[PDB]
């Protein structure tokens, strides 16, 4: 049958394989685990709620053959456009609209657009020399310009010192053009995104058609007649351009387009959301996670922050007038700290955040990401981080979309389970969270006064011991801190002001509590373990990792010799 | 609609004989007749 | 555009002089009898020999005008003059 249909090439030109960006078709084949619906088919679940589970595989099937289903050579069909994107779907399939909305959710089309606009404008700021550009002014256009397919304005304007000797319009790669014909004072750059069908995906005809329509027509308001039009095909991973060149534009723009097309984060978030919507694996894990073998990377000179969301959406259960109970939201905190200097930016989320909305455990992810983006924007460039460690893996996807706005900040998911949720159970923190009447940022210094007598790395591991104790037993440890009434806490201060001998003894009490309770709970004694295994336990690191394997192999190699 | 589409087939291969494949037919008399005869049938229905 | 109201005839349209219609250019002597009126609105609306009146209900031509319209309308004539062409394509073969 595969020779009957013509081969994998003539099968895969129908499919959405070109937009995913796997390297080869051979990676279509994996032991794919179903994930969500596997968990959900066993639960106690309504009659109406169980037939909804069976339209999850149909959305993936409809996504995969979506160039062929949403093709352009149709018999009858009135073309409509999606809401916050620019996709024209011929008629009405309800499965395909859900798939493409899930792909382009959180306003991703417009983020891709202004991402490529700022990237072009930053390259043109970098080259106010030898192109002889006076100024590159970025235009402020209508927020619906990213997907107004009727007409468009320009969004980058190039004003020159004296004159530009400007060629006749031709494509980006036509190698022969005379610069002598025309003279302009200013030029315009414009970026057009199209989503291609199975039929209509000749991108060069698209860019020449958009240029030759929008320059001659009167609806599209351009500053000068001279400019260039840049077009990108998102469904099929292609680019081209058309318009007026001078001496120096074309080799700059073709290299700009190939590197932006390979390394834009926005287009990577698109291709990743496509791979997720099709449920296919591609391991691209260039930097290792924050495991126990990397552990001291936190204590470099460069600034970085831990973000944590576990206490952002909390509720209280209460009895209704009927039999069933209901949940009402309470105050929350976004736990962000930097481990080198102990600054603790504590975002108190009031309940006026959750005022009218619902689903409330999906929205909390986007609330944390939006608030972290506001915190990072409020910092200066020298004081913005260079790295952000996300604790839970469900906080990757909102932070990636909101940190599209800051491309120079790395994001590393952690590999070791961190106890910062137990930071709610400190009464000085819990008090300030609960008494709040207004959504606000409150600063704490979680290393109380330790950084004078105690260096920062042992202070972080001390805080690890304390928070693992308060997450493990929560009252035995809270009584271990509160043995003596003589040691108080100050007004500025979080922890009881112990001397350092007392910190040595109480850290010993904490590791005794943690390791004894662990060995009692999981029926595995601490004494027969490696020092690697205990350092693995206390930091909350997980086994089945590749790092535990390669660490044990490296220790075996080091101790066999 | 199918009538108009069928009429296109019998007009184009009288028009495009020995002159290619482009647009530019513009012999719009038969399709115009089809949609007028639709309109007189849906006058009494849409008044109702 | 979808958000543009329809422009007023009295301002934007009526003061513009019109443009050139199709108008196949006729010969001067081969198409002599039909040249001066072929492309009017109602071609002989007021010519009481060739029409009844401006009510425009009946028509009567000579022979050269009718012959000229016969030659000039070559691409849309029937050009089947014997009834034995429709041997098994007449209406009644279709009914059978």
């Amino acid at each position: 049958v595969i020779q009957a249909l013509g081969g994998i090439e003539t099968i895969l030109e129908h499919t959405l394989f070109k937009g995913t960006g796997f390297n080869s078709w051979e990676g279509l084949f994996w032991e794919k685990a179903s994930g969500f619906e596997d968990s959900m088919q066993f639960k106690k679940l309504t009659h109406a709620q169980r037939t909804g589970l069976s339209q999850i595989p149909n959305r993936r099937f409809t996504l995969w053959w979506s160039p062929t289903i949403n093709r352009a050579n149709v018999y009858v069909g009135f073309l409509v456009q999606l809401d916050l994107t620019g996709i024209f779907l011929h008629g009405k399939i309800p499965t395909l609209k859900i798939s493409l909305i899930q792909i382009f959710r959180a306003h991703l089309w417009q983020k891709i657009h202004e991402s490529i606009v700022f990237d072009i404008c930053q390259i043109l700021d970098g080259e106010l020399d030898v192109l002889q550009i006076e100024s590159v002014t970025k235009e402020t256009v209508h927020p619906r310009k990213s997907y107004k397919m009727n007409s468009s304005a320009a969004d980058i304007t190039m004003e020159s010192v004296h004159e530009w000797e400007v060629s006749k319009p031709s494509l980006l790669h036509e190698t022969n053009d005379s610069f002598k014909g025309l003279i302009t004072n200013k030029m315009w750059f414009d970026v057009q995104l199209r989503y291609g069908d199975y039929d209509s995906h000749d991108i060069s005809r698209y860019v020449r058609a958009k240029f030759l329509d929008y320059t001659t027509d009167n609806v599209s308001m351009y500053p000068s007649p001279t400019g260039v039009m840049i077009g990108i095909d998102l469904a099929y991973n292609m680019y081209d351009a058309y318009g007026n060149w001078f001496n120096g534009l074309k080799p700059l723009i073709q290299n700009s387009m190939r590197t932006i097309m390979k390394a834009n984060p926005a287009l990577y978030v698109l291709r990743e959301r496509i791979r997720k919507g099709l449920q296919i694996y591609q391991s691209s894990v260039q930097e290792p996670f924050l495991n126990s073998s990397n552990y001291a990377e936190l204590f470099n000179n460069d600034i970085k922050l831990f973000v944590d969301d576990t206490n952002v959406y909390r509720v209280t259960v209460h009895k209704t007038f009927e039999g069933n109970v209901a949940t009402k939201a309470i105050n929350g905190c976004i736990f962000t700290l930097n481990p080198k200097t102990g600054h603790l930016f504590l975002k108190i989320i009031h309940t006026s955040v959750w005022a009218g909305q619902k689903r409330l455990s999906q929205l909390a992810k986007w609330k944390t990401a939006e608030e972290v983006s506001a915190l990072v924007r409020s910092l200066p460039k020298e004081e913005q981080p260079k790295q952000i460690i996300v604790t839970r893996k469900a906080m990757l996807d909102p932070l990636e979309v909101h940190m599209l706005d800051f491309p120079n900040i790395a994001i590393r998911p952690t590999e070791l389970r961190l106890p910062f949720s137990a930071a709610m159970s400190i009464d000085k923190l819990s008090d300030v969270v609960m008494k709040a009447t207004e959504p606000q940022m409150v600063l704490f210094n979680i290393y109380d006064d330790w950084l004078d007598r105690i260096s920062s790395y042992t202070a972080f591991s001390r805080l690890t011991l304390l928070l693992r104790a308060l997450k493990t037993n929560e009252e035995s440890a809270k009584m271990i801190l509160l043995s003596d009434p003589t040691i108080t806490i100050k007004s500025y201060h979080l922890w009881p002001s112990f001397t350092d001998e007392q910190w040595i003894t109480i850290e010993s009490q904490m590791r005794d509590l943690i390791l004894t309770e662990y060995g009692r709970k999981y029926n595995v004694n601490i004494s027969a373990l490696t020092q690697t295994e205990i350092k693995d336990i206390i930091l909350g690191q997980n086994i089945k990792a590749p790092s535990v394997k390669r660490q044990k192999m490296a220790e075996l190699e080091a101790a066999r010799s | 609609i199918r009538a108009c589409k069928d009429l296109k087939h019998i007009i184009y291969y009288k028009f495009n004989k020995n002159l290619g494949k482009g647009p530019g037919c513009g012999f719009w008399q038969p399709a115009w007749r089809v949609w007028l005869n639709f309109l007189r049938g849906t006058i009494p229905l849409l008044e109702r | 555009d979808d958000d543009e109201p329809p422009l007023s005839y009295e301002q934007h349209i009526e003061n513009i002089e019109p443009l050139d219609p199709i108008n196949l250019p006729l010969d001067s002597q081969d198409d002599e009898y039909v040249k001066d009126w072929l492309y009017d609105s109602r071609p002989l609306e007021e010519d009481s020999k060739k029409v009844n009146g401006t009510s425009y209900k009946k028509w009567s031509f000579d022979l050269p005008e009718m012959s000229n319209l016969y030659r000039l309308s070559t691409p849309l004539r029937d050009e089947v003059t014997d009834k034995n062409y429709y041997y098994l394509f007449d209406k009644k073969s279709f009914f059978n």
Partner: protein
């Protein structure tokens, strides 16, 4: 004027005769605002 007599102000009828909502509707509003076949048939004729 028919749409605005019926109480439906969040439906927008632009000058190329398309009917699209100006917000995200509730279900009560989607019940109150299902226009018939007759409205949309007259609407597509005006569009043509």
């Amino acid at each position: 004027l028919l749409i605005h007599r019926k109480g439906l102000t969040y439906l927008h009828l632009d000058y190329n005769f398309n009917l699209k909502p100006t917000k995200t509707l509730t279900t009560k509003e989607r019940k109150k605002s299902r226009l018939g076949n007759s409205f949309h048939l007259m609407r597509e004729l005006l569009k043509m």
